[PDB]
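A favour, since you know our structure tokens better than I do. Would you make up a two-line entry for one protein for me to read? Write everything out right here, beneath this request.
=====
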Amino acid sequence: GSPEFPEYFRCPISLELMKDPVIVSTGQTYERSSIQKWLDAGHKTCPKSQETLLHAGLTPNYVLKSLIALWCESNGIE
């Protein structure tokens, strides 16, 4: 029983959790402030195993916001 999950709720970036979650190639959905922080730096690899995103384009994924927004409501996480 551990609250460990890559997506859906908290970001694996720094356990900040996401509000507006952004999808990128490779199918990652993390918070823009965490992902685009390093993607903008010129890198395009996932934080999991460094799966090269190849095409670095930020596609806003609205599926997760209502979910993550639910979890940071349970615990004030950021």
Summary: The first strand starts at residue 21 and ends at 24. The chain is about 25% helix and 15% strand.
